[PDB]
Amino acid sequence: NEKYEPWEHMKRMGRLVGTGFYIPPEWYNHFRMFPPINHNFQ
């Protein structure tokens, strides 16, 4: 399954925070600066 993915979860959290009525946890901004490791493009 690809619908449960760290990039998909980060995109879901980003568009959840981008409303302005949700408060981001610290791991969202800490994963924007340290993204999850991808298996592609290698």
Partner: protein, 236 residues
């Protein structure tokens, strides 16, 4: 080199999203790990826009730089002062100037230049309508912002530093912006407008040839903005 060119590119409107996408394409797709020149060329471009998301991106990039074993230098603190000055935040500029001397990194003339520009942008973004509700004149805040930067100008001539053109241009910008804001907010107080205009003419007429400096595009830009705000079309 591409990020350095996009940091000063004014050909199109999309230079900053192009730089963001190029940095993301370099890190994720190309597999390159960002060094100090990548972080410097990105944070110099992120420090130009006063949007809070881009300032947050610059702060998170500086934090990732200090977390990845790349220590801060004069250029990193200069980029942070540039990012904090465009929103008019003098408190963050003073915290960066104190943290720079905490680590023993000496502050050069450009840091004080962008501190003066931080005072300019803090004079710009005063909520004048809230002071109009409280019946408070913004004149002592303008006098404090002037005397602080003139104390900085007395500091840079006491340390024996070579006087640079952007510092005198920042002082001229400060005095011309104080004159413009005094004409906009307190139009009936003609004596303060006259004092600010006399200080601006003193900086424009005597200070440039005191340090044997030659005027440039920004020096003419600030004075042309001053003369255009006074509706003196022929002199402009």
């Amino acid at each position: 080199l591409q990020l350095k060119a996009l940091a000063k590119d004014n050909s199109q409107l999309n230079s900053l999203p192009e730089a963001i996408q190029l940095f993301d394409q370099m890190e994720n797709v190309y597999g390159f790990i960002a060094s100090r020149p990548h972080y410097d060329a990105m944070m110099f471009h992120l420090s130009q826009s006063p949007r809070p998301e881009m300032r947050l991106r610059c702060e998170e990039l500086a934090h990732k730089m200090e977390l990845m074993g790349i220590v801060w230098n004069a250029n990193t603190y200069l980029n942070l002062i540039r990012s904090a000055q465009v929103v008019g935040d003098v408190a963050a500029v003073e915290k960066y100037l104190s943290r720079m001397r905490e680590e023993g990194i000496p502050a050069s003339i450009g840091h004080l230049t962008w501190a003066v520009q931080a005072h300019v942008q803090s004079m710009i973004r005063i909520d004048y309508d809230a002071l109009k509700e409280k019946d408070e004149s913004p004149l002592p805040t303008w006098l404090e912002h002037l005397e602080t930067c003139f104390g900085i100008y007395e500091l840079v001539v006491r340390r024996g530093w070579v006087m640079q053109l952007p510092f005198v241009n920042a002082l001229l910008r400060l005095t011309c912006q104080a004159t413009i804001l005094s004409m906009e907010r307190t139009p009936d107080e003609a004596e303060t407008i006259g004092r600010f205009e006399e200080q601006a003419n003193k900086i424009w007429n005597h200070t440039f040839d005191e340090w044997q400096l030659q005027k440039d595009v920004y020096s003419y830009e600030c004075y042309i903005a001053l003369l255009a705000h006074q509706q003196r079309i022929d002199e402009a």
